[PDB]
């Protein structure tokens, strides 16, 4: 018995047999069930049971150190087998998790142990971050609950008819009329009722309507609000993750007022730019530790011909990129003839090289094998669709292009780790797809009526392909809309599922991928006086002040300016004065530093360009020609030099300046790869996004209009999609929309509906086109776009080393030791006296640990009391809650009084004591103020705002938490640099705000631009640009500002400005903004955070921390 089992388990054939069985079982899990599946399930279960029996007979069960159930993997196997028997003999919710056995297949890929260990270490290291995350989210949920409670229910309700059609006024008849949903404003074909508010700057109502509270439901089937702590929690988590967050942001600003933008800024700054970067830092440290452990453990043959072939390759690529939809016949002939010529040249090259060199030596070269494969494919293509393989020719450019060559060699050097990570990602997606299919698939079929028109949504769980696509989309960062659908037809189980998918896929696996990338990709007197004046402090301060004031004046030139004559005059006068000022300043600087210094400096060149622009505008105005707006807007660029001199800014600007060349190289490589995908996209989809519509832009059925001829015979419209693959430029724009995941859903809907040209698309007739986008997303968004962060991280570390005056050649250990030696230099001990029988007794009672723990418990209880508040509660409940809060305030005041009585003046030697003392004083003053306000009823919003001080007494809960204290210390050390980065971001936003006001203030309402969100004033422009800095909603903004169709041109004689945008201008504006902010400046936060977190953690683990010195001086 025992001998057989012991020999059987160690035989490799046994392990391969089990693995192959698991693989076929997974395959059968993908396909639809049938009676044959039931018997195959029994076969698989028998095989797994035999494995369990063999291993128990070989090891024993638990009682010894090396028994069967001392290995976690065996725990997985055993629990899944038991679940299988349980579900076979006797809830279907348990039948899914047999797919968990597939996790074992991770052990097939060589080098799997490193990645699995890194994942395990990352998961175990998030312990303190989870607690801090939950606390922060709760605090923000409370703040949002008190600020936005009830706002998302606002609606425009028609006035009670004075005509008497609804009867004479009575309170009952008025309530009866206002509650009828047919009297609530909603534009035709809309799903959601628009929000409103009567505060200055909120959404307005049409005439005959008033903005009311308490009617109807909240947005998104009632799932989006701040009416309870739980929904507020959900909304805050959504906001931190940036998941469709522009919609909640616009809803709140439209119902509450633009000033509530402040709330969103705070949440985005703390939660997105700091905390998720803590998560990334933990993942990076874990991976670095594992890799450290692993590593420690241990004619034709001439340059001229090469150049000739290189230019021929470039010309062939150009010819390939020129292909487009509905080409004229001459264009087609030219391209075809060019193809013939290129193929002939490649054939000649192959033969010449094979004969000049030996055939044996010819096929010993990898590049030669690649070229021969290309020649074979080309000749096969011309002989006989093999055109898709023509793209291989593009990759020959890597032989001649050193940057691309190095990029390729780096990938070759470490392909194994990336293979492991991608396999883990896809295995996780497969497991979740199967689980979600079993849990939710039948809900969509059974409860289809609940959907807006009773139709199945594009994204569902009805079969394996759709389930995989929806979980993959969640991994890309979009989870909440799918969760709304799941809840609508399901129950609470949808919430944990999607959250888990998002957390594991996005915050762990993708972060691990970027960690891999980082690890791998990483007269004489006149000159005298002018010189003295130029170097003088006061003169520079005066110049800076003038620049700042006139730049602020630019922000006031909004759409209302023509109605304000005094402002018009002030701006004109300021323009004249600035012209004189710039000229005189240029002369002074020239006399100070001279011609050669002046004209070899980039700063002085910027100044000179501004001087020339203002002189040109002056000459134009003299001639009677209206000044160019762009030229006089160029003066804002003067702000950057004084900005670069702010305290602590030098590290940030040095990092960006040093990073520019690498960023450019990455952009070039990305353009190359995107060219490959764009040519493929044109080949697949060019000309196929046309469809037949009617007066309402509603797609007709193919059963009615089969093709273009039917469409036009019935006098319908054969309209193209604004985003398409008709030529390479449009393909590039569509691929940018895909990679950023902004507007990609419509593009993919068109792609999977596509049929041959001139035919009516059919829903999901070409579903497997999804594979195209998956590949692009893996190689364009997960790989190429994440290099920017790695570059910034690597460069910022070096620049900070420069700033602190540290040597570059020193090792990390030496710096750790120097840090400890610096700490020991500045530590000292403190003692306090225990007072006086009464005071001494109170001292003994207050200095004990029980007292502090009790204070913590009281804080937790007060926090729960705050969580009880909800929308619609009776006023009696409001009063009871306020009185309970009063009790808590009295208790904390008493704590402070006792501590003061005990410690006398020593009390203020501890910083936390000072914070608590300030909070107590503020609470007393606030109680007085609240009583006065509530009695005199100043304003409900004012009361809500001043109630924000209540959070002060809850923030003390972090006192004494060591793990949380470490991360807060890291954040404190980084605060200066984070602030400087934020300041730079805001200045860039200001520049873009004023140029956007100039370019787009008059455009018609379309897409995301409407009466509330637009470029009409500086504030509204900033509201839009803060949203756009995260790339959120930029597709709708582009659709608005790029529209050149169906518009009125300006009438200079009549003064009418016109109302439509510019495709080229909008493309330039938005693409440049996305690159500068989303891909560069925002990633600086991650760089800074990572450096500081790493420092503190290494101090904790391989050195000494301030707490070590504190403990040493506790004894002393
Ligand atoms: C600004 O923003 C506010 C929040 O978003 C919004 O409320 C406000 O809208 C409405 O503005 C008008 C002023 O033009 C204001 O009158 C509205 O409030 C009135 O509420 C009364 C409540 O009646 C109650 O009925 C219950 C029954 O259970 C009873 O118990 C209560 O004691 C109370 O009686 C309505 O009855 C009233 O309707 C008017 O009543 C007058 C009485 O004769 C009558 O002459 C009028 O013609 C009319 O019929 C109002 O609705 C206010 N909305 C709400 C919900 O209060 C918005 N705009 C302004 C201008 O404030
Ligand atoms: C994901 C990362 C999992 C952790 C990694 C791991 O396998 O470690 C635990 C351990 C191996 O430990 P070590 O011995 O350190 O490994 C060294 C190799 N000899 O493996 C196990 O116990 C395997 C069990 C893990 C299976 C993972 C399954 C993932 C899918 C989860 C689905 C969750 C569904 C939730 C939906 C909720 C709906 C209400
Ligand atoms: C706090 C700073 C807020 C400063 C804002 C200045 C606003 C000036 C102004 O014009 O106010 C407009 C307007 C008044 O509107 P009403 O007339 O009531 O309209 C009601 C319906 N008709 O102002 C507002 O609504 C402002 C509300 C802004 C709140 C944003 C809060 C941001 C974050 C708060 C976090 C605080 C947490 C505290 C932590 C701990 C403290 C110890
Ligand atoms: C790894 C990731 C693990 C994910 C698991 C954690 C999520 C579990 C959340 C369970 C929530 C229970 C749902 C039932 C419920 O009522 O919850 C509170 C509430 C609804 O309350 P009521 O107003 O009574 O609803 C009726 C009104 N129409 O539900 C929510 O919106 C809660 C959602 C919580 C979001 C959590 C996401 C963040 C988690 C961090 C990681
Ligand atoms: C489309 C309409 C709106 C378009 C507006 C675009 C806004 C772009 C804003 C950023 C650039 C503004 C112009 C700056 C000119 C730079 C002149 C100059 O001297 O540069 C070098 C100078 C070094 O200064 P020193 O005195 O040597 O050292 C002291 C440091 N404290 O650089 C700076 O300080 C500039 C820092 C600005 C950040 C720019 C980099 C970020 C964007 C790069 C992404 C694209 C790369 C490809
Ligand atoms: C910094 C970057 C600044 C960007 C500069 C852009 C300058 C403006 C050029 C636009 C010119 C223009 O108007 O061309 C329109 C013309 C379309 O004509 P239609 O009539 O629609 O053809 C019929 C379709 N059925 O061309 C285009 O669509 C051009 C699109 C330009 C590509 C923009 C995307 C760039 C992607 C950046 C690379 C990202 C990867 C790097 C990492
Ligand atoms: C019960 N009832 C009839 C009265 C009766 C007694 C007097 C008060 C009580 N009413 C009540 C109690 C608690 C909250 S409360 O639960 O919201 N707690 C809050 N704590 C703080 C703490 C400080 C603060 O202002 C500080 C700033 C004001 C200007 C500058 C400093 C405001 C708040 S409000 C509230 F709203 C109001
Ligand atoms: C230095 C860095 C780190 C922080 C920068 C400060 C911002 C938080 C400031 C700078 C400009 C401010 C904006 C200036 C103008 C406005 C318009 C204001 O609303 C109005 O225009 C009210 C009138 C109306 O809506 O009718 C709302 C506040 C807002 C967006 C301000 C909100 C706060 C902003 C973004
Ligand atoms: C108004 O009253 C009628 C009956 O008089 C009732 O059927 C209807 O539901 C009421 N509408 C409301 C309360 O919105
Ligand atoms: C709303 O008003 C319309 C028009 O009078 C009426 O037909 C409808 O029944 C009303 N709905 C309710 C719920 O009262
Ligand atoms: C367009 O929509 C409106 C509102 O549903 C409808 O009345 C009209 O008949 C529609 N037009 C066509 C051509 O279907």
Numbering used by the authors: 129 to 218, 223 to 430, 515 to 600, 608 to 745, 842 to 1154, 1157 to 1437
Provide the authors' own sentences about this structure as they appear in the paper:
Voltage-gated sodium (NaV) channels initiate and propagate action potentials in excitable cells and play important roles in health and disease. NaV channels contain 24-transmembrane segments linked in four homologous domains (DI-DIV), where four peripheral voltage-sensor domains (VSD1-4) surround a central ion-conducting pore module that houses the ion selectivity filter and key ligand and toxin binding sites. The NaV1.7 channel is expressed predominantly in the peripheral nervous system, and genetic studies have identified compelling loss-of-function and gain-of-function phenotypes in human pain syndromes, prompting significant efforts to develop NaV1.7-selective inhibitors as potential novel analgesic drugs. Thus, we sought to exploit an engineered human VSD4-NaV1.7-NaVPas cockroach channel chimeric construct that had been previously shown to complex with small molecule inhibitors and peptide toxins known to target VSD4.
We hypothesized that the acylsulfonamide moiety of GNE-9296, which places the two aryl substituents 4.7 Å apart, might not be fully optimized for use in hybrid inhibitors. In comparison, an arylsulfonamide moiety would position these two groups at a distance of ~3.3 Å. On this basis, we designed N-benzothiazolyl sulfonamide GNE-1305 (compound 4), which demonstrated potent NaV1.7 inhibition (IC50 = 9nM, n = 8). Our last hypothesis was again validated with a cryo-EM co-structure of GNE-1305 bound to the VSD4 NaV1.7-NaVPas channel. Here, we observed the typical face-on pi-stacking orientation of the S2/S3 substituent with Y1537 while maintaining efficient space filling in the S3/S4 pocket. (E) FSC between two half datasets yields a global resolution estimate of approximately 2.2 Å resolution from the refinement using an overall mask of the VSD4-NaV1.7-NaVPas channel bound to GNE-1305 (compound 4) (F) Local resolution of maps. The quality and resolution of our structure allowed us to assign 111 water molecules for the highest resolution structure. In addition to offering valuable information for retrospective analysis of historical NaV1.7 VSD4 domain inhibitors, the structure of GDC-0310 inspired the development of a class of structurally differentiated inhibitors that trap a novel conformation of VSD4. These hybrid molecules bridge both the S2/S3 and S3/S4 helical gaps, with the anionic moiety situated centrally, interacting with the arginine gating charge network within the core of the domain. We have demonstrated that potent hybrid inhibitors can be designed with fewer membrane-associated elements than prior generation NaV1.7 inhibitors, and anticipate that this will offer opportunities to develop molecules with improved lipophilic ligand efficiency and/or differentiated pharmacokinetic profiles.
